[PDB]
C-alpha cells in the first residue's frame, strides 16, 4: 500500500495526530471547469506533485497529447501532433513533440493511445512541466 519510501509519506496540511475520545484527506479543485476526480477524494495515496492533492498550481497553458509510454513512475510521456506550414510550398509537414507529463495516481486505469489533457504548472523535474488534468478513453476500447 502506502509508506514504501524511506521517510513518512504524508500530506503536509492535515494534522493526523489530534487526540480522540478515519484520516481526513486534503483535496481541492484546480479550476477551469476541471472537475476533481472521485479517486482524489476517496484515495489513500499521497502525492507531492498531484494537481488535485498536492502543492502545485495549474497556470498558463492547457494542452492535450497522446499517451505513448507509461514506463516512468508517477509520470508518463504524451505525444503531441501538429501540421507545420512552409510558405514556399503551400503544404504541411507532420511534426511532433514528445513531452513528459506528471500522471497523478488518481487517474487509475490509463492505457497507451488515449488523448490526455495536460496543464502547465511549476517545473516539476528536469523535463516535466505539465500535470494530467483529465483522461478520455480511445476510439472504443471500452472492453
Amino acid at each position: 500500500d502506502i509508506q514504501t519510501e524511506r521517510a513518512y509519506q504524508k500530506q503536509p496540511t492535515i494534522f493526523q495526530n489530534k487526540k480522540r475520545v478515519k484520516l481526513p484527506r486534503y483535496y481541492k479543485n484546480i479550476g477551469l471547469g476541471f472537475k476533481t476526480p472521485k479517486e482524489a477524494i476517496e484515495g489513500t495515496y499521497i502525492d507531492k506533485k498531484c494537481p488535485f492533492t498536492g502543492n502545485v498550481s495549474i497556470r498558463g497553458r492547457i494542452l492535450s497529447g497522446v499517451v505513448t509510454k507509461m514506463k516512468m513512475q508517477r509520470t508518463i510521456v504524451i505525444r503531441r501532433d501538429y501540421l507545420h506550414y512552409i510558405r514556399k510550398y503551400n503544404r504541411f509537414e507532420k511534426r511532433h513533440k514528445n513531452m513528459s507529463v506528471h500522471l497523478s495516481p488518481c487517474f487509475r486505469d490509463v492505457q497507451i493511445g488515449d488523448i490526455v489533457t495536460v496543464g502547465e504548472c511549476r517545473p516539476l523535474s528536469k523535463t516535466v512541466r505539465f500535470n494530467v488534468l483529465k483522461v478520455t478513453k480511445a476510439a472504443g476500447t471500452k472492453k
Binding site: 509508506q3 519510501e5 524511506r6 513518512y8 504524508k10 493526523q16 495526530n17 528536469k126
Partner: protein
C-alpha cells in the same frame, strides 16, 4: 565557482549543449552547512539582494512543538537517530530538514504536570523530596478542582509516548532548514508516524 546550471548538462535527448556564456554570479552554489550538535555557532552569509542567511554549524537547542496538546518549548537536542536521506548523516550527527532527533522530555513533562496535575514519566517508587512536584500536583481550591477534574479526562496520552516519557527523551522531526534559517525547529512524532519511525529504528537495530 560551484554552480547551479542547466546549461552545464545534457539535453532531454542526451546531446551536449555547448555553453554560450561564463558562469554568471546569480547561478550560485555554496558549500554545505553540515550542522552538527554542539555549543551553538551560527555564521551569517551575504545573500542576493543584500539579504542574509544564518548557517548553523553547531546547534544544541531547538524549538520543538508537541502538536496534539499544543506546547512548543526550547529544548536541547541530544542525538540524531534517523535520516531518510543518508545513513552517514545519522552517523556523523547532522541536523537537516526532516531528520529525526531525540530531545529531552523535561519541558513537556513540566507543562503536562502544570496543566493537568498528573504524573508523567515517574517510574513508581521514586518520589521527589524537594516538594516542587508536590505543590504542582496538590493545593487546588474547591472551585477549581472540578476544572482540573474536567481536564483530567482529556489527559490520557499514547502508550508509546508514555514509554518515551519514562525514558526521559522523545523523538522529534525537524521541519525548519538549519543551514538556511538558523533554527532547529521541529515537532514531536506521534501516532502512525511515530510507530512508522519506531519500526524503522527497530529494523535498523535488528
Amino acid at each position: 565557482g560551484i554552480s547551479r546550471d542547466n546549461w552545464h548538462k545534457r539535453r532531454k535527448t542526451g546531446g551536449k549543449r555547448k555553453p554560450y556564456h561564463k558562469k554568471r554570479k546569480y547561478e550560485l552554489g555554496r558549500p554545505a552547512a553540515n550542522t552538527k550538535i554542539g555549543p551553538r555557532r551560527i555564521h551569517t552569509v551575504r545573500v542576493r539582494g543584500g539579504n542574509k542567511k544564518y548557517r548553523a554549524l553547531r546547534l544544541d537547542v531547538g524549538n520543538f512543538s508537541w502538536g496534539s496538546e499544543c506546547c512548543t518549548r526550547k529544548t536541547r537536542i541530544i542525538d540524531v537517530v534517523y535520516n531518510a536521506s543518508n545513513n552517514e548523516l545519522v552517523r556523523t550527527k547532522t541536523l537537516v530538514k526532516n531528520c529525526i532527533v531525540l530531545i529531552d522530555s523535561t519541558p513537556y513533562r513540566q507543562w503536562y504536570e502544570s496543566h493537568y496535575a498528573l504524573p508523567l514519566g515517574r517510574k513508581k517508587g521514586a518520589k521527589l523530596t524537594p516538594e516542587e512536584e508536590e505543590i504542582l500536583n496538590k493545593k487546588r481550591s474547591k472551585k477549581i478542582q472540578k476544572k482540573y477534574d474536567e481536564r483530567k479526562k482529556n489527559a490520557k496520552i499514547s502508550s508509546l509516548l508514555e514509554e518515551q516519557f519514562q525514558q526521559g527523551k522523545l523523538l522529534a522531526c525537524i521541519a525548519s532548514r538549519p543551514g538556511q534559517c538558523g533554527r532547529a525547529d521541529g515537532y514531536v512524532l506521534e501516532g502512525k508516524e511515530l510507530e512508522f519511525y519506531l519500526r524503522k529504528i527497530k529494523a535498523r537495530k535488528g
